[PDB]
Amino acid sequence: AEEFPVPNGFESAYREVDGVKLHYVKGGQGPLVMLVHGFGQTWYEWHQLMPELAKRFTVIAPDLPGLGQSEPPKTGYSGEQVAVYLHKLARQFSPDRPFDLVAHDIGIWNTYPMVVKNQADIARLVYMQAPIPDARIYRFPAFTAQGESLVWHFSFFAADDRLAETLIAGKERFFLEHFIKSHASNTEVFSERLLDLYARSYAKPHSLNASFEYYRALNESVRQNAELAKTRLQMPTMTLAGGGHGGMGTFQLEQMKAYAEDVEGHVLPGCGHWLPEECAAPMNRLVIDFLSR
Amino acid sequence: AEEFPVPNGFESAYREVDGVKLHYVKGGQGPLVMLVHGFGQTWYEWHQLMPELAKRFTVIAPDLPGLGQSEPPKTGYSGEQVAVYLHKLARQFSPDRPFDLVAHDIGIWNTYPMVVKNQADIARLVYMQAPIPDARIYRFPAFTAQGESLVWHFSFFAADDRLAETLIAGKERFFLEHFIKSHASNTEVFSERLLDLYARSYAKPHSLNASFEYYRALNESVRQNAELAKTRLQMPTMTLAGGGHGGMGTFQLEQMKAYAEDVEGHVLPGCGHWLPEECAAPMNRLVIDFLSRGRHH
Numbered sequence A: 001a002e003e004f005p006v007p008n009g010f011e012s013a014y015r016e017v018d019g020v021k022l023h024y025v026k027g028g029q030g031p032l033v034m035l036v037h038g039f040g041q042t043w044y045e046w047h048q049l050m051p052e053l054a055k056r057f058t059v060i061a062p063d064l065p066g067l068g069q070s071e072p073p074k075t076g077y078s079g080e081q082v083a084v085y086l087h088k089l090a091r092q093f094s095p096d097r098p099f100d101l102v103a104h105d106i107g108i109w110n111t112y113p114m115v116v117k118n119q120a121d122i123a124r125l126v127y128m129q130a131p132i133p134d135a136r137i138y139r140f141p142a143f144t145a146q147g148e149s150l151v152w153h154f155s156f157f158a159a160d161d162r163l164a165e166t167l168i169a170g171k172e173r174f175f176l177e178h179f180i181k182s183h184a185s186n187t188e189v190f191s192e193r194l195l196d197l198y199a200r201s202y203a204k205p206h207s208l209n210a211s212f213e214y215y216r217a218l219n220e221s222v223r224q225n226a227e228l229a230k231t232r233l234q235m236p237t238m239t240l241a242g243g244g245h246g247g248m249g250t251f252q253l254e255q256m257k258a259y260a261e262d263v264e265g266h267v268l269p270g271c272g273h274w275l276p277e278e279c280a281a282p283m284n285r286l287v288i289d290f291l292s293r
Numbered sequence B: 001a002e003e004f005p006v007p008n009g010f011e012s013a014y015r016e017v018d019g020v021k022l023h024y025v026k027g028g029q030g031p032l033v034m035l036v037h038g039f040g041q042t043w044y045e046w047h048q049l050m051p052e053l054a055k056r057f058t059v060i061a062p063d064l065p066g067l068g069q070s071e072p073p074k075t076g077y078s079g080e081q082v083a084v085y086l087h088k089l090a091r092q093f094s095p096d097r098p099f100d101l102v103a104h105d106i107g108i109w110n111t112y113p114m115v116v117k118n119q120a121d122i123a124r125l126v127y128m129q130a131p132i133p134d135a136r137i138y139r140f141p142a143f144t145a146q147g148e149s150l151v152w153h154f155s156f157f158a159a160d161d162r163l164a165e166t167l168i169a170g171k172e173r174f175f176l177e178h179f180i181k182s183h184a185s186n187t188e189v190f191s192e193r194l195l196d197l198y199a200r201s202y203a204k205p206h207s208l209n210a211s212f213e214y215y216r217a218l219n220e221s222v223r224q225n226a227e228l229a230k231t232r233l234q235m236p237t238m239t240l241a242g243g244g245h246g247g248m249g250t251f252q253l254e255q256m257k258a259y260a261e262d263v264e265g266h267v268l269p270g271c272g273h274w275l276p277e278e279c280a281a282p283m284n285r286l287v288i289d290f291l292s293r294g295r296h297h
């Protein structure tokens, strides 16, 4: 059945995009807002924001190709390839108006190329909790004086020999719980049930592989973005980042300043990586107000 | 029982040191040289160098505490704690004379404190393929544009919840082949037969755990070395590094210059992390020649 419970007033549905069957959850009325999840998660990370946003917007939350209930991409996992699927999906529902885009973690990687190449289609942009793939990612440290670093998983997941799938298979729940909590400030929000739901979804063999193929394409995404970034983003943009353990801190806004002419940023003290869940109410408020103004 | 074949004329034996039974392989005659292995391996990485050194030296190659056939340490896994075991082991065989030291990878971590605290006991020193634990390790990148990050495994192995043992238990042979080859230039020397030998040893549950406790103690070792490094090393030192995939390149010598007054360095082209096996002929030559500048049999 459904991997995650659908909110009242929303529908779980599918659309073929370039031969790939994409799953999404959709509700509401008005101009379109697309919410794009990241690693370890699915559309469901947005399930608290979606009903509030649906009071003023049509809201669509897709599963990334190969994750949740979406088929793997038939082209590839680089940012430019994946962004085609998400752009065409959004245009099926908002052909005559620009739409809003909210993205978390690798949802940024998988949307930035279509934002920069189709700027007239993007009304307002919200990015949270991950670098746009560029040379700045090569400066993050492998190890810190307090223990494990924030992004050593870039190398673990990008390694060949199916290193990550092979070590994590049979231990998917254990690994995801450790990964979520090592990047969280507020772990209490991750109940047994919620961890069970996310672990069952990404443990599907094609989804476990899909998860890491996004990282195996990361250097290709960096190289793609080096050319794309010659064009700055002109639409109103907001960045959000956690200020606590697991948070990107000032990096999110400071990077975005190099990409966007019109950008405002917020750092949320006491919040880590998983902003829609760790800090749902303030994150929801900031997104709703930014998109409603 | 012997996890690895002893070279002809060498003996495999044990010595209790501060309540810990240490395994070693010993042969030859003359002044003492101690060879100290690194992560993923045992004394056996030295087995091709040992017979040539034993023509001029007494050679001892111990298994690090918890690894190979050595018991885990009873104090802890920080560099200063482990170095006590290795210093006392060496001085049992060379109580009245300084000895030479060769160390690879975390063998460096586990010997640097006893070298700096007992400088008169160390005649000549050879370090290869790992940083001495200090603030420089916090500058290595998590992810690279070309090749692969050299030390992302520091975070993996140091992570809480026994993350590394829990994921690697039952897959030790798979993991070690990937780890070794990903850090090599000349991967072809790591035959399935050789990988089988190394994997069987570190798959002992206490050895798998011991392996990662060295990394869980790495930040403590950094803090220890911040104090110890206020005195530079005075004895003749040589560094070796690979210049190929997995090699430390110029970092090995450049860091050692901050630690040693008398240092010469070499980068071996076409060689990665596993110098004794990837590049046995030039590495053995450099080590034998450097140690033979001092008095020998």
Ligand SMILES: *[C@@H](CO)CCCCCC
Pocket: A038, A039, A105, A106, A129, A130, A150, A151, A183, A246, A247, A248, A273
């Ligand atoms: C998603 C991208 O890999 C997780 C990001 C974690 C890095 C900083 C917390």
Ligand SMILES: *[C@@H](CO)CCCCCC
Pocket: B038, B039, B105, B106, B129, B130, B131, B150, B151, B183, B248, B273
């Ligand atoms: C030993 C140190 O953990 C092997 C790792 C290789 C990285 C740089 C030498």
